[PDB]
A paper describes a structure:
The archaellum (or the archaeal flagellum) is a specialized organelle that enables cell motility in archaea, serving as the functional equivalent of its bacterial counterpart. Archaellins correspond to the basic building blocks of the archaellum filament, where they are organized into a helical array. Like archaellins in other species, the Hbt. salinarum archaellin is tadpole-shaped, consisting of a 45 residue-long N-terminal α-helix and a C-terminal globular domain organized into an eight-stranded anti-parallel β-sandwich. The globular domains of the archaellins face outwards and constitute the hydrophilic surface of the filament, which is mostly negatively charged, while the α-helices, which are largely hydrophobic, bundle to form the filament core.
Specifically, cells deleted of agl27 lack the fourth N-linked tetrasaccharide sugar (a sulfated glucuronic acid), while cells deleted of agl26 also lack the third sugar (a sulfated iduronic acid). As with the map of wild-type archaellum filaments, we focused our model building of filaments from each mutant strain on the central regions of the maps, which had the best quality, yielding models of 25 subunits for archaellum filaments from both the Δagl27 and Δagl26 strains. Next, we compared the arrangement of archaellins within the filaments by aligning the polypeptide chains of the three models, without considering variations in N-linked tetrasaccharide conformation. Such alignment revealed the three models as matching almost perfectly, with very low root mean square deviation (RMSD) values of 0.62–0.78 Å. Specifically, the density next to N80, which could accommodate three sugars in the map of a wild-type archaellum filament, had become smaller in the map of the Δagl27 strain filament, being now able to only fit two–three sugars. The same density was further reduced in the map of the Δagl26 strain archaellum filament, now accommodating only one sugar. The density nearby N93 fit two–three sugars in the map from the parent strain, yet only two sugars in the Δagl27 strain map. In the map from the Δagl26 strain, the density was further reduced and accommodated only one sugar. However, Δagl27 strain cells exhibited swimming in both single and ever-changing directions, while cells from the Δagl26 strain tended to swim in a restricted area and exhibit jerky movements. After differentially diluting aliquots of spent growth medium from the parent, Δagl27, and Δagl26 strains to account for differences in the degree of archaellum filament release in each case, cryo-EM micrographs revealed that whereas wild-type archaellum filaments were well-separated and usually straight, archaellum filaments from the Δagl27 and Δagl26 strains tended to bundle and curve.
Author numbering:
A (entry chain E): 13 to 116, 120 to 193
B (entry chain F): 50 to 115, 120 to 193
C (entry chain D), D (entry chain G): 13 to 49
E (entry chain N): 146 to 193
F (entry chain P): 50 to 97
């Protein structure tokens, strides 16, 4: 009856090897999608970055009430949503992080379009969107000589730092470049 | 094991920036903005610990609410003020420099290591500016 | 008996290696085109 | 039986890779602070 | 494989994620995490 | 045998950090912060 016993155990070890086979394949499938995701976001973190073209602001009396920035995609950048981005404003007085808003604000920022389709998303390389920040609202209208340290942080994590330096003299200037 | 070990490597915190409030002439608050890593999952800031190697002390800060020798998390962008769910969420980690040890003077250096629940350590060497004159808020 | 067990697990390991091989290569393919551009 | 041995060695390789991944990231973090300073 | 998104739950939005395990008759499971692109501006068809 | 052998491999300790006190000019305290490894059970630190 030793032929009976081997048959039963043979069935069991087939199942056990199938159980272990599932574990390696299923865990590899888990790590396949996890690793595939990791490469794409990590590349997006390094490549999808905002580049500031030029900075200027409207000035009233002698203290720049509004601060405006012109942004664009960096080299090899996918769609860049300016709505899921946060500019951190480190000014002479206040030092907070601004968030996206619509229709002009207080401690928020607005993005009006200059060239392109969307007015909040940079889709192509020739799109220019104007980041709008109210200086007198976030803190105070910067006098001649104030030095704000702006840093635009994209959703994925790419950070662009711009030191907005107000000219030391604001005389006879309807609107000066920061 | 496969799920936890991948969690140990993947679910990691990246510190976007670090700034500090200034009273009189000393950094009294240490504020840190945090975000997920590439491929991170939901990161809970309540099950995280921060190691504060200060100039005068060395303790491991734990989570609290509304500090002293603990740390609080006020939200910046997103819904949850203690959990980072999406890649566009920013939460501000709050630390009281004049409560975990002594008020950070101009030039003090503190090492902060934010350890997630799964064990992903992120180290940020905070350096108070050498000169603090005429600076209402500094960038650590 | 033990011969049956090692055969099935052998099939498992090559597929897992095939899965792992695809992950690195396809990720390199994404990085190649992104890097090239 | 062969499956039993594979599962145990599978855990070790996952754990060992986690150890190796930890060294790379933590050393990069130390060098990042050194380079930034 | 044709799967109507608007009927199973709802037409996905930019940034969504679905975990799909296509299991055969014999129990072989294949897991795919479909990830809608974070931005759907000016793209007739994407690649999850 | 299966359970203890798995515990030998899976139940492990990970040292998160290693700080220490300083007296005069000598380290009089060695402190270790420890945590479970991936997929570990309860770890009594008295039988270690
Ligand atoms: C930043 O962009 C703002 C976008 O609205 C500009 O706002 C306009 O400024 C004009 C003037 O220069 O003061 C006003 O006539 C418009 O009504 C106002 O919207 C702002 O000038 C610029 O710095
Ligand atoms: C770090 O975060 C703190 C969170 O409470 C900020 O605290 C506020 O600071 C304000 C001011 O800048 O001093 C006070 O008006 C608030 O009452 C206080 O809670 C802190 O400013 C920041 O650096
Ligand atoms: C300008 O020079 C001052 C000379 O006294 C410095 O003052 C000292 O700074 C120390 C520290 O570096 O913050 C404090 O511990 C001393 O109490 C303080 O007098 C000052 O730091 C420097 O910016
Ligand atoms: C650019 O940022 C926009 C910020 O509002 C995104 O807008 C939201 O998109 C959601 C979805 O992803 O389609 C909608 O459910 C929301 O109602 C809409 O405001 C936009 O998707 C993004 O591309
Ligand atoms: C390791 O942990 C020890 C736990 O007791 C710490 O011990 C304290 O150290 C203090 C000082 O830093 O020397 C003493 O004032 C306490 O009495 C002593 O218990 C130790 O500092 C730490 O390195």
């Amino acid at each position: 009856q030793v032929g009976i016993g081997t048959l039963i155990v043979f069935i069991a070890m087939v199942l056990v090897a199938a159980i272990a086979a599932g574990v390696l394949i299923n865990t590899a499938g888990y790590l396949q999608s996890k690793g595939s995701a990791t490469g794409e976001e990590a590349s997006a973190q390094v490549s999808n970055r905002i580049n500031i073209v030029s900075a200027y602001g409207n000035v009233x009396x002698x203290x720049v009430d509004y601060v405006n920035l012109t942004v664009r995609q960096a080299a090899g950048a996918d769609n860049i949503n300016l709505x899921k981005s946060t500019i951190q404003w480190i000014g002479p007085d206040x030092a907070t992080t601004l968030t996206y808003x619509x229709x002009x604000x207080x401690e928020n920022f607005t993005t009006x379009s200059i060239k392109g389709x969307x007015x909040x998303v940079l889709v192509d390389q020739s799109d220019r969107i104007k980041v709008i920040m109210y200086a007198x609202x976030v803190x105070x209208x910067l006098x001649x000589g104030x030095e704000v340290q702006l840093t635009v942080t994209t959703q994925y994590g790419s950070k662009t730092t711009y030191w907005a330096q107000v000219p030391e003299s604001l005389k006879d200037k309807n609107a000066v470049x920061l």
